Design an enzyme around this catalytic site. Structure first.
Site, short mmCIF file in Angstrom:
data_model
loop_
_atom_site.label_atom_id
_atom_site.label_comp_id
_atom_site.label_asym_id
_atom_site.label_seq_id
_atom_site.Cartn_x
_atom_site.Cartn_y
_atom_site.Cartn_z
N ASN A 228 -7.70 8.68 -5.94
CA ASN A 228 -8.50 7.70 -6.67
C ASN A 228 -9.28 8.33 -7.81
O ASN A 228 -9.49 9.55 -7.82
CB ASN A 228 -9.46 6.99 -5.71
CG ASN A 228 -8.72 6.32 -4.56
OD1 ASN A 228 -7.71 5.64 -4.78
ND2 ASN A 228 -9.20 6.51 -3.34
N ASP B 111 -12.38 8.31 -8.45
CA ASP B 111 -13.65 8.90 -8.03
C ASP B 111 -13.48 10.23 -7.27
O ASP B 111 -14.47 10.83 -6.84
CB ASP B 111 -14.48 7.89 -7.21
CG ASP B 111 -13.85 7.55 -5.87
OD1 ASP B 111 -12.75 8.06 -5.55
OD2 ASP B 111 -14.47 6.77 -5.11
N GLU C 100 0.81 -1.22 0.00
CA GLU C 100 0.00 0.00 0.00
C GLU C 100 0.84 1.27 0.00
O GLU C 100 0.55 2.22 -0.75
CB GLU C 100 -0.96 0.01 1.19
CG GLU C 100 -2.05 -1.05 1.13
CD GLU C 100 -3.05 -0.83 0.00
OE1 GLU C 100 -2.98 0.19 -0.71
OE2 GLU C 100 -3.94 -1.69 -0.18
N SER D 198 -11.80 10.58 -4.41
CA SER D 198 -11.40 10.29 -3.03
C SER D 198 -9.87 10.13 -3.01
O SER D 198 -9.23 10.06 -4.07
CB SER D 198 -12.09 9.03 -2.51
OG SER D 198 -11.62 7.89 -3.21
#
Ligand SMILES: [Cl-]
Ligand SMILES: [Cl-]
Ligand SMILES: [Cl-]
Ligand SMILES: [Cl-]
Ligand SMILES: [Cl-]
Ligand SMILES: [Cl-]
Ligand code: NA
Ligand SMILES: [Rh+3]
Ligand SMILES: [Rh+3]
Ligand SMILES: [Rh+3]
EC number: 3.2.1.17
Length: 129
Positions: A46, A48, A35, A50
């Site tokens: 992201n 979207d 990660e 976010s």
């Protein structure tokens, strides 16, 4: 802060992640590796709109407030910036909520794709734990 592998394993253990919801410590270390490369300051936007924050790339869509993710929630009741701290408490506490949400560690797509089913104990091999 960029943690060492065993340093992060020890911090995660002290904060109660070893076998939390049945996930051994190596699963958590492996997830953080892919990660964030163990960097608390990691951020990623992201598609979207976010953003993912911190060692476990926790997303603003559901879990933290960053003031710029419309329609989102803040289920961990924290500013997303708290997830970038050298102190991993906020990330660990929020991760506990995420992993309890129903899908276990599959919430972390990188865990599913890169850690799940592999020899995750390798991630804590050699560490004083
Ligand atoms: Cl490493
Ligand atoms: Cl393990
Ligand atoms: Cl927002
Ligand atoms: Cl909320
Ligand atoms: Cl806030
Ligand atoms: Cl599970
Ligand atoms: Na949010
Ligand atoms: Rh601590
Ligand atoms: Rh153990
Ligand atoms: Rh502390």
């Amino acid at each position: 802060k960029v943690f060492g592998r065993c340093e992060l394993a020890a911090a995660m253990k002290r904060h109660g992640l070893d076998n939390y919801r049945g996930y051994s410590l190596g699963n958590w270390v492996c997830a953080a590796k892919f990660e964030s490369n163990f960097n608390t300051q990691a951020t990623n936007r992201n598609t979207d709109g976010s953003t993912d924050y911190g060692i476990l790339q926790i997303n603003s869509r559901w879990w933290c407030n960053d003031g710029r993710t419309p329609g989102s929630r803040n289920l961990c009741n924290i500013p997303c910036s708290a997830l970038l701290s050298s102190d991993i408490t906020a990330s660990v506490n929020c991760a506990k909520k995420i992993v309890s949400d129903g899908n276990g560690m599959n919430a972390w797509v990188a865990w599913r794709n890169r850690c799940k089913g592999t020899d995750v104990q390798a991630w804590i091999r050699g560490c004083r734990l």
